[PDB]
Amino acid sequence: SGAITAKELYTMMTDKNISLIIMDARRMQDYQDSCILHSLSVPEEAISPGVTASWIEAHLPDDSKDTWKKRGNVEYVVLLDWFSSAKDLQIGTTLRSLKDALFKWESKTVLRNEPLVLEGGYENWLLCYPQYTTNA
C-alpha cells in the first residue's frame, strides 16, 4: 500500500467526494514554475531526515501553515516529488522524511490514513494530466 496512481488521483480530484491534500515536496522554484492545482508546497528545503511535523510547520509561510494544521481533517494526504514512487522511500529521501514526520514521529495531529505516494511523481502527472496543473 501507501501508493496512488495518477489515474486514481485524477479520479479523486474530479470526484470531489473525498477530501484530500496533495503535498509537493519538490524545490520552491520547481513548485512555482508548475504544480498540481490546489496542492501544498512542503518544499525540499524545509525537509531533512529526522524532522518533526512541527519543525516542518515552523518553516512554512502563513498560508501554507493553515493547510498543514488541517492535515488531520482530510481523508487522504498525497505525497509527490519529481520522479519517485512508494518503492523509493529510503532513509534520507525527502519523501521518506516527510512521510515519517506526518505518520511516524511525534505529532499533535494524527492522520486519518497512511499518506500515499504518487507513482511516477510530477513528471508523470505533467504528461498525463497537464490541465490539472498551474501553467497552460
Binding site: P61, K65, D66
Partner: protein, 121 residues
C-alpha cells in the same frame, strides 16, 4: 536622533503577499536578518529589540497568532513599513505607526519576514 535618521535612510516597502509571512523564523534566519539590520546601521539601542520582535512570540496581540493574522490581514495594508536592505523582510517602527494601535505595534517596532513579494513603493 540616531533612530529617526536610520529610519529615514531606509526605503519605503510594499508587502504584496501577506500570506507569505514567516512568523516563526529559525535562529539562522534571525541572525541573517539581524546582520542586515546592523549593516544598514541600525542603532545598538534598538537592534536587539527589533530582532526579538521578528517572531510571533514577541508580536503584539493584533499579530500574535496565525488565526489573528488571517483575520486582520486587510488592516495590515495601513502599516508604514521600511525595507530591510537586500531581504524579503520589513521593519514597522512605532514612530511611523501611531495610527495603528498599541496592539498592532509596540516600541521600538517589529520585524516581519516573508517568503516573497516584498517590493519598494
Amino acid at each position: 536622533n540616531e533612530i529617526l535618521e536610520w529610519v529615514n535612510s531606509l526605503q519605503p516597502a510594499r508587502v504584496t503577499r501577506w500570506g507569505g509571512m514567516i512568523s516563526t523564523p529559525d535562529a539562522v534566519l534571525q541572525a541573517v536578518i539581524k546582520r542586515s539590520l546592523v549593516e544598514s546601521g541600525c542603532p545598538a539601542s534598538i537592534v536587539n529589540e527589533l530582532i526579538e520582535n521578528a517572531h510571533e512570540r514577541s508580536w503584539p496581540q493584533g499579530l500574535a497568532t496565525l488565526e489573528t493574522r488571517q483575520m486582520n490581514r486587510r488592516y495590515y495594508e495601513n502599516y508604514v513599513a521600511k525595507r530591510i536592505p537586500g531581504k524579503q523582510a520589513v521593519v514597522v517602527m512605532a514612530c511611523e505607526n501611531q495610527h495603528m494601535g498599541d496592539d498592532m505595534v509596540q516600541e521600538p517596532g517589529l520585524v516581519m519576514i516573508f517568503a516573497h513579494g516584498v517590493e519598494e513603493i
